[PDB]
């Protein structure tokens, strides 16, 4: 089951957590869902992406692992800034994560990391 970084869409309110995760795995087509494969995890670990995230969240110091993480507006903006200012800020995965963050800001959503 790939790592997800996501928020719900604008007109989706599902409050039960397990059900939100189920929604994300069922809506991988969504612009609000980033699916991240093992090979992406490794590629970006070795380039310092997760370390950049960890500067704000203090998690994933050694990359992602099984678990659930919830990112609030303050941290969403802070991570978004880190990524926009980074050396891979134009690479698709980073753009895709940025986009989830922007959407969550715009639509007042919590961002979930799930693996
Ligand atoms: Mg709305």
Swiss-Prot record:
InterPro entries on file: DMP12, DMP12_sf
Protein role: Acts as a DNA mimic. Interacts with the DNA-binding protein HU and partially prevents the binding of HU protein to DNA by occupying the DNA binding sites on the protein. However, the relatively weak affinity of DMP12 for HU suggests that it may not completely block the HU protein-DNA binding, and that DMP12 is more likely to act as a regulator than a competitive inhibitor. It protects HU protein from limited digestion by trypsin in a limited trypsin digestion assay, suggesting that it may serve to protect the HU protein and improve the stability of unbound HU protein.
Molecular function (Gene Ontology), one example: metal ion binding
Gene3D superfamilies listed in its UniProt record: 3.40.1760.20
Protein name, UniProt field: DNA mimic protein DMP12
Domain of life: Bacteria
Signal peptide: none
Subunit structure comment from the entry: Monomer. Interacts with the dimeric form of the DNA-binding protein HU.
Native source organism of the sequence: Neisseria meningitidis serogroup B (strain ATCC BAA-335 / MC58)
High-level lineage: Bacteria, Pseudomonadati, Pseudomonadota, Betaproteobacteria, Neisseriales
One Pfam family matching this protein: DMP12
Domain notes: The shape and electrostatic surface of the DMP12 monomer are similar to those of the straight portion of the bent HU-bound DNA and complementary to those of HU protein dimer.
Family as reported in the entry's similarity comment: Belongs to the DMP12-like protein family.
